[PDB]
Structure formats: C-alpha cells, structure tokens
C-alpha cells in the first residue's frame with residue numbers, strides 16, 4: 001500500500017515523498033520517522049504522524065548538508081497490517097538539485113544586461129546564518145547564452161553576478177538563458193530563461 | 202638469442218595509451234611480440250604473441266602508476282624485456298582543444314571544447330579529470346610577429362577592443378594552473394572582424 | 395608536514411566515480427544502526443591528529459577491503475582504487491607528534507567491527523567511501 005518512498009531535494013530543501021498503492025483505504029494514514037545514519041533511535045517528525053497526505057518537509061530535521069540520514073514511512077490501512085518502507089541513504093550535499101538562478105533581465109538599446117541575485121538556502125554556517133549557494137560550493141559559476149537563430153549564439157560565463165551582452169541591434173528579440181553550475185559534484189541547474197527585446201532606440 | 206624491440210615508446214594522447222615499438226633489425230621475418238602490465242605483485246599479459254608493432258593500453262586506470270614491458274619472441278626462447286614506467290593522468294599528452302569563433306563587430310567571441318578522453322563510455326573531457334584545467338589564448342594579426350595572451354577557465358572568451366576590419370588568427374591550448382604542464386596548441390582558425 | 399592539498403578532492407571525474415562506487419555499495423547495505431566512518435571514529439581525537447586518523451582509515455580500507463575486493467563493484471573500483479592509493483602515498487610523510495592511543499584503539503575498533511560483520515562489513519566500508527573521501531578532505535585540508 002506504500003511505494004516510491006523517497007527524498008526530493010532542491011537547494012537543500014529536503015521533502016519526503018511517498019505514494020499509496022492498489023490498496024489505499026479512505027482513512028489510510030502515514031507516519032514519518034527519520035534518523036541520522038548510524039543511530040539506533042528513530043525520531044518522529046511532530047507534524048507528520050497519522051496524516052492522510054503523501055509528503056513531509058524534513059528540511060529542519062536534515063539541515064546538516066554534510067550528514068547522512070534515513071527516513072521511513074509507516075502506512076496503516078483500515079483492514080490491517082502496517083507496511084513500513086524507508087528511503088535510500090540521503091545526503092543533501094550529494095543529492096540536492098540546483099534551482100534556476102534568481103535573475104532579472106534588463107533590456108537595453110544595443111545590449112542585454114543580466115543581474116543574478118543570491119539565493120539563500122536552509123543550510124547554516126557554524127555561527128548560524130543561512131548560506132548562499134556561493135557559500136556552499138566555492139566552485140559555483142554562471143553560464144549564460146543569448147540565442148538569436150539556430151546558427152548564432154553569444155556566450156558569457158563567470159563567477160560575477162552582472163552580465164551584459166554587448167553589440168546588439170536595436171528592437172530585436174533574443175532568448176537569454178542563465179544556468180548555475182557546480183563542476184566538482186557535477187551539479188547543473190535548469191536554465192532561467194528570459195524572452196527579451198532590446199529597446200527600439 | 203633474439204634481438205629485443207627497438208625504439209619502444211608509450212604514445213599516449215588524451216588518455217589514448219598505445220605502447221609502440223619497431224620491428225628489430227633481423228633478417229628473419231618470423232617474429233612475435235608479447236606485452237604486459239603490472240597488477241600489484243604480478244604482470245598481466247595484454248598482447249600475447251602478436252605480430253603487430255603496437256599494443257593498446259587505454260584500459261589502464263588514469264590514476265594508476267603502471268609499468269609496461271614488451272619482448273619479441275620465437276619458439277620457446279624469448280628476449281629480454283624493455284620496460285617503461287607510465288602513469289596516464291600525469292604523463293599523457295593533452296590534446297589540442299576545439300574552438301569556434303563568432304566575430305560580430307569589433308569583437309571576437311570564442312568558444313572552447315576540451316579534448317574528449319577515450320577511457321570512458323561516457324562523454325568525459327580532459328577538463329572533467331583535471332581540477333585545474335584552464336585555457337590559454339594567444340592572438341595576433343597576419344602582418345605582425347608580436348603576440349598577446351589571455352587565460353580563461355571557462356569555455357567561452359571574448360576578445361574586446363581591437364582595430365576593425367582586420368582578420369585575426371587565434372589558437373588555444375590546455376594547461377594546468379597548479380602544474381608546469383602545457384597541452385598542445387590547436388591550428389589557428391581565422392575569422393574576419 | 396602532514397596536509398593534503400584541496401586540489402586532490404576537486405576532480406569532477408574522481409568525485410563522480412568515488413561517489414557512484416559508494417552508492418552502489420550503500421544500496422546493498424541495510425544496516426542503518428552501525429556506521430564506520432562516523433562519530434564513533436572521531437571520539438577523543440584532537441583535530442590536529444584527525445588527518446593521521448584518516449591516514450590510518452584510508453590505508454585500512456585499501457588493504458583489508460579494497461584490495462581483496464577488487465573483483466566486484468566495477469567499473470568504478472578500477473578507477474577509484476588507484477586514486478585512493480595515490481592519497482595514501484602522499485600521506486606516508488604523516489606522523490603524529492604525540493599520543494596515538496586514541497587513534498590506534500579506534501582504528502582497531504573499526505577493523506573489529508568490519509570483521510565481526512564478515513562480508514556485510516566489507517560492503518559497508520565501500521558504501522562509506524564518500525564519507526572516507528569527505529572525512530579525508532575535512533581532516534587534511
């Protein structure tokens with residue numbers, strides 16, 4: 001009655017998800033338990049006990065990006081016996097995906113300017129403040145592309161947060177896409193994509 | 202006895218590891234060769250009694266320190282071995298990177314592609330193995346011998362502010378930012394401004 | 395006199411192959427209660443001695459689990475073991491200027507736990523090569 005019990009983790013936002021089965025009663029409930037790998041005691045998430053929904057936010061409970069954890073879901077059915085399935089060993093630092101960067105595209109007369117803004121994450125520093133992606137992956141950088149037609153593209157990349165595609169013709173439509181990359185762990189965000197048009201001068 | 206292989210060398214570029222030798226000066230064209238690599242305590246046959254003058258060692262681990270040896274042989278009697286010491290990631294030749302130029306107007310837009318390694322059934326590049334991979338760009342015109350250089354760690358670069366309506370020719374090479382290791386230069390690809 | 399350079403952990407290739415190796419072993423490891431390279435390993439080891447502790451765990455994992463166990467978990471085992479060996483040789487020049495009664499008791503208690511679990515103990519260490527990689531990083535740079 002329980003299947004696909006897994007973590008779905010984006011920018012260190014760590015959500016437990018599972019699904020019912022071909023035997024999912026009206027009042028079938030699910031309880032979530034989590035623990036750090038190598039511990040004997042299973043902790044119980046206060047929010048997700050005997051709940052009818054099929055997901056649970058474990059971000060606060062798995063906040064150590066350098067740690068290893070496990071979680072399990074217990075589904076109890078009206079007619080009887082309970083089924084308990086747990087997740088694969090979870091490491092946020094290794095399993096999290098990157099959200100597209102927070103960008104504002106600014107159309108100019110003969111260029112296109114792009115500003116990438118820092119994204120805070122739920123992982124804390126030793127002193128207890130939230131980190132930016134740049135603070136977690138020192139290797140983070142931005143790859144930007146400005147697409148004109150199948151045959152012509154402009155590329156910029158760097159660690160900075162300001163980018164400007166220079167030398168464009170006015171009143172022209174362009175497609176800008178900005179991507180975050182973390183090479184060491186081979187992480188790559190989906191692109192942020194702007195449909196922009198240079199100002200008509 | 203039999204004379205050993207001549208001019209034995211490991212020809213390795215972009216982790217394409219080929220042990221090469223030459224057929225010795227020997228007026229009898231009946232001659233087989235056998236090549237081995239070290240597996241901890243013990244050697245492994247890799248080419249056993251081959252007629253060829255080369256043996257492919259691309260299956261070797263990148264970070265492994267390997268010693269390779271080859272001998273010519275006939276009947277029960279074999280030659281002395283000729284050994285070479287070889288570690289792929291430290292000794293292989295860095296092939297030239299690929300480059301495309303998109304010159305719009307009084308600018309030169311470069312895009313690079315690191316050489317692909319044949320070790321893996323996946324599209325791995327030499328940039329994916331070395332932690333300090335970066336590109337050196339060298340540029341000049343066609344009436345000067347004088348040069349200019351720029352270094353970039355990303356697959357893209359723009360040469361900004363030059364004289365307009367002048368055809369430039371540029372090349373790129375791989376190198377490591379923490380080593381004294383230089384890769385081979387590409388051939389200059391030219392596009393007009 | 396006993397430090398690794400950060401560069402040794404920043405190869406996208408070696409990190410992918412090491413972590414992919416650890417994941418395939420850890421998927422076959424359902425013993426969530428016992429953790430090898432975990433806080434029980436760092437009990438009473440000053441931070442200046444922690445790299446030497448990891449020097450002992452790496453060479454332990456190479457000699458007693460990875461060398462006898464080069465036959466499965468391919469294709470990653472073929473590339474990761476030469477990498478880990480290169481890390482042990484850089485660290486031969488490492489020696490603690492003090493009392494290693496806490497390191498030898500914990501590295502021995504480790505070798506005891508892997509062997510009381512027989513084969514299940516050997517797969518657990520391979521499933522913990524990401525922890526080894528990252529404890530070696532955090533302890534030696």
Ligand SMILES: *[C@@H]1O[C@H](CO[C@@H]2O[C@@H](C)[C@@H](O)[C@@H](O)[C@@H]2O)[C@@H](O)[C@H](O[C@@H]2O[C@@H](C)[C@@H](O)[C@@H](O)[C@@H]2O)[C@H]1NC(C)=O
Nearest residue numbers: 094185186187323324325326329406409410411413414
């Ligand atoms: C390890 O690499 C696997 C292959 O990806 C290659 O390398 C990258 C850099 C790029 O060149 C690409 O074109 C190559 O195919 C990769 O599949 C694997 O990811 C894992 O498997 C996929 C199918 C997903 O399940 C993913 O979530 C897994 O982590 C890489 N693994 C790690 C840990 O880096």
Ligand SMILES: *[C@@H]1O[C@H](CO[C@@H]2O[C@@H](C)[C@@H](O)[C@@H](O)[C@@H]2O)[C@@H](O)[C@H](O)[C@H]1NC(C)=O
Nearest residue numbers: 148149150151152167168169170172173305
């Ligand atoms: C594709 O686009 C190329 C680049 O020119 C771009 O297009 C014009 C309209 C202006 O916007 C200019 O600023 C841009 O850089 C062209 O040179 C090329 O001819 C085009 N080819 C095809 C097949 O459409």
